[PDB]
Ligand binder design. Structure first.
Ligand SMILES: [Cl-]
Length: 129
């Protein structure tokens, strides 16, 4: 599922991401944009052999099990495939754990490099929320 900008904003708000750990809704939409182009099926392998999954590109090294990242963890206690669903509940719930681990949204490189310090509110402008 490829989300619309406002469709995704609505979904994230409904799942309680707006100002979660102090991150306004626009941060999350900006992050999803540059991480996955709003595409729940997005996947990307990285150097250590781990894989990033879903609309928020959650990594198998720590957060989910994909059966092919030896010595990794599964801190969200989910199969990584669950992160590829059209329903973002799994991704959002897992994201909540990640942004809570002490490093905030810096855990998402795309957010750090492309959303942080920008006018992130622009990402939810015009949306019925
Ligand atoms: Cl991540």
């Amino acid at each position: 599922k490829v989300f619309g900008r406002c469709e995704l904003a609505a979904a994230m708000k409904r799942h309680g991401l707006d100002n979660y750990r102090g991150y306004s809704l626009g941060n999350w939409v900006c992050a999803a944009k540059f991480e996955s182009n709003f595409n729940t099926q997005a996947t990307n392998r990285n150097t250590d052999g781990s894989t990033d999954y879903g609309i928020l590109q959650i990594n198998s090294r720590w957060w989910c099990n994909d059966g092919r990242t030896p010595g990794s963890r599964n801190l969200c206690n989910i199969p990584c495939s669950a992160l590829l669903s059209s329903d973002i509940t799994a991704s959002v719930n897992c994201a909540k754990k990640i942004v809570s681990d002490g490093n905030g949204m810096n855990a998402w490189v795309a957010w750090r490099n492309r959303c942080k310090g920008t006018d992130v509110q622009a990402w939810i402008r015009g949306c019925r929320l």
